[PDB]
Design an enzyme around this catalytic site. Sequence first.
Site, PDB file in Angstrom:
ATOM      1  N   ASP A  65       0.778  -0.980   0.328  1.00 23.14           N
ATOM      2  CA  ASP A  65      -0.123  -0.114  -0.102  1.00 23.14           C
ATOM      3  C   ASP A  65       0.742   1.061   0.407  1.00 23.14           C
ATOM      4  O   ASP A  65       1.674   1.320   0.997  1.00 23.14           O
ATOM      5  CB  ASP A  65      -1.141  -0.003   1.362  1.00 23.14           C
ATOM      6  CG  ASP A  65      -1.816   0.892   1.334  1.00 23.14           C
ATOM      7  OD1 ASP A  65      -1.485   1.314   0.696  1.00 23.14           O
ATOM      8  OD2 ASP A  65      -1.688   1.246   2.657  1.00 23.14           O
ATOM      9  N   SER A 142      -0.126  10.426 -17.475  1.00 21.89           N
ATOM     10  CA  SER A 142      -1.489  10.919 -18.172  1.00 21.89           C
ATOM     11  C   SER A 142      -1.337  12.609 -18.944  1.00 21.89           C
ATOM     12  O   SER A 142      -0.419  13.510 -18.898  1.00 21.89           O
ATOM     13  CB  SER A 142      -2.871  11.673 -17.089  1.00 21.89           C
ATOM     14  OG  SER A 142      -3.962  11.709 -17.427  1.00 21.89           O
ATOM     15  N   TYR A 155      -7.771  15.739  -9.788  1.00 20.51           N
ATOM     16  CA  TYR A 155      -7.025  14.304 -10.679  1.00 20.51           C
ATOM     17  C   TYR A 155      -5.770  14.698 -11.256  1.00 20.51           C
ATOM     18  O   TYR A 155      -3.778  14.096 -11.515  1.00 20.51           O
ATOM     19  CB  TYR A 155      -7.687  13.462 -11.280  1.00 20.51           C
ATOM     20  CG  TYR A 155      -6.830  12.432 -12.029  1.00 20.51           C
ATOM     21  CD1 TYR A 155      -6.767  11.300 -11.719  1.00 20.51           C
ATOM     22  CD2 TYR A 155      -6.684  13.201 -13.919  1.00 20.51           C
ATOM     23  CE1 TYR A 155      -5.923  10.467 -12.772  1.00 20.51           C
ATOM     24  CE2 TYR A 155      -6.080  11.650 -15.075  1.00 20.51           C
ATOM     25  CZ  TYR A 155      -5.845  11.043 -14.159  1.00 20.51           C
ATOM     26  OH  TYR A 155      -4.802   9.999 -14.716  1.00 20.51           O
ATOM     27  N   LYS A 159      -1.077  14.721 -11.386  1.00 21.46           N
ATOM     28  CA  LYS A 159      -0.578  14.052 -12.630  1.00 21.46           C
ATOM     29  C   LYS A 159       0.487  15.072 -13.053  1.00 21.46           C
ATOM     30  O   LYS A 159       1.538  14.839 -13.416  1.00 21.46           O
ATOM     31  CB  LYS A 159      -1.311  13.206 -13.580  1.00 21.46           C
ATOM     32  CG  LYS A 159      -2.224  12.440 -13.280  1.00 21.46           C
ATOM     33  CD  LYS A 159      -1.606  11.561 -13.194  1.00 21.46           C
ATOM     34  CE  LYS A 159      -0.808  10.607 -13.870  1.00 21.46           C
ATOM     35  NZ  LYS A 159      -0.855   8.806 -13.544  1.00 21.46           N
TER      36      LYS A 159
END
Lengths: 276, 276
Positions: A65, A142, A155, A159
């Site tokens: 994790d 991304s 998000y 990134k």
Amino acid sequence: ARTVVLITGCSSGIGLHLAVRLASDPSQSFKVYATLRDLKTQGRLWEAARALACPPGSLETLQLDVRDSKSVAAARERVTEGRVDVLVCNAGLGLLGPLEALGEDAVASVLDVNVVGTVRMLQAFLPDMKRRGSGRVLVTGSVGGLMGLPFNDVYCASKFALEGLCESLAVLLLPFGVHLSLIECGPVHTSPEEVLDRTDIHTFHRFYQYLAHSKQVFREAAQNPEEVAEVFLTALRAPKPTLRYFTTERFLPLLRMRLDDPSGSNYVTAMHREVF
Amino acid sequence: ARTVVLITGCSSGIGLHLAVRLASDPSQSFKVYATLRDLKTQGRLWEAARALACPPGSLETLQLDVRDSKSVAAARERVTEGRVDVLVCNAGLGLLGPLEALGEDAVASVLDVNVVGTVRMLQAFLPDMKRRGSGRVLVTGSVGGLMGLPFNDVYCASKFALEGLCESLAVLLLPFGVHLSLIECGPVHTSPEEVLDRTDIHTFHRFYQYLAHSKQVFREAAQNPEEVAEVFLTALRAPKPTLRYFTTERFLPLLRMRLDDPSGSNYVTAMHREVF
Ligand SMILES: C[C@]12CCC(=O)C[C@@H]1CC[C@@H]1[C@@H]2CC[C@]2(C)C(=O)CC[C@@H]12
Ligand SMILES: C[C@]12CCC(=O)C[C@@H]1CC[C@@H]1[C@@H]2CC[C@]2(C)C(=O)CC[C@@H]12
């Protein structure tokens, strides 16, 4: 000796397909440690592994994790070879919705897994690579790390953060023999009531428009994960890997527009018209 | 009615100078709420305020810790006018050193203050702006949010994150009448033993080289905070503000190089030679 690969986030998507692509390579070049947050999600990975006939011992799963430095350390200790040739930082979370509708915990989690988790992996594995003067680090990037996307604010923050993190490290790592590369992915094949309660009706309507648009872009442009996984392999075998690999050229024009008008005006207008 | 301004991180630097610049404006146009993490650090702010003869009532201090959503909410309730015309998200932390020498807590803190803290402010103040269809949000950016800097990996991660966050929101906010702008700053005038214990001697030596280089760049290029504060005012008065303002053109060439070679190769080589 085999190339030892450790990959985070292998329960689905890019990480699952990359892990079975490497473990099943015809040359038997790779030993893959496919890591997963929760071992209860490893079934798809093993179903894919058998489908590709990964030899016994080519693939092993570890619980890892990225939010917990103790879990990172315990997984590192499980690499029996005592070295990692290729580290693939791929674990990541998305977060979609009106910024004011996102929970504070969800925001903090996206940054802890996507950014701090990658830092935890680099801190745990980078020093041995630097000492040896060898090692490849691949980070799943991304198009949302290269240009801002509406309703993906946190998000994209995460990134974009990986871009800054990796680019900063690449400048230092240049002469050490350790190679870091971002693999820049576009879309890949892998309640309204609550959103409405936390935002205005106009933002709610724009969210619907975004979603409808996103579905069409996805239906038209999503790449197969096998094609995406192959770009990771291309980066791994390059003698002198670049900082960034693109899995598609579809968004280069938008990226160039963005990059050519540093005031941001052209990009903001162009992307607003593209989505809405 | 006066323009109500709320600014985070006013104990020193850009936020302190911006707050006294606005409060002392000859036109008495602005009412400034200068917020600070710890009220024990407000002396320099009040010393500057008297030096510029800020009228009584033009400037008020509030305790506001961006890591705590309850502190954000309590400060918002203290805005007696019941509206914020201009929100300036400026609170920020730096972090400098070999990535493996940084404490996990220091990394998480930089991201919580710099990124999640800005999200907390936007969540707390954006909705009222959207409803009214007016309001200006200025965010203190950095050249380190536009290009990766060695030994600033987590700091650049955080500043890159603000770029993604702001750019994503700008795409949505375009038609709402709410204007968000990043103010892109270069350098501004505002133990080795422990680092050596946590890294290798080669990385340690490169850190010294970076520091020596950074000191020279700073000595040669640091801008006065008054000049930087004025760019915030320029953005505030623009009828149709752009997403990004630059306080200097010094780094545009490096930015263009970076933006013109999406593989990152040119930038990484160029910045490695520039620093080392
Ligand atoms: C986010 C998403 C769709 C969700 C995803 O998995 C990534 C992909 C990246 C490119 C995005 C796309 C949504 C629609 C967008 C925003 C466009 O119209 C151009 C950029 C496109
Ligand atoms: C980080 C710092 C120095 C510290 C600071 O306050 C910001 C400023 C931004 C530009 C940086 C500079 C250090 C030296 C750098 C890295 C260069 O040689 C070009 C970019 C320069």
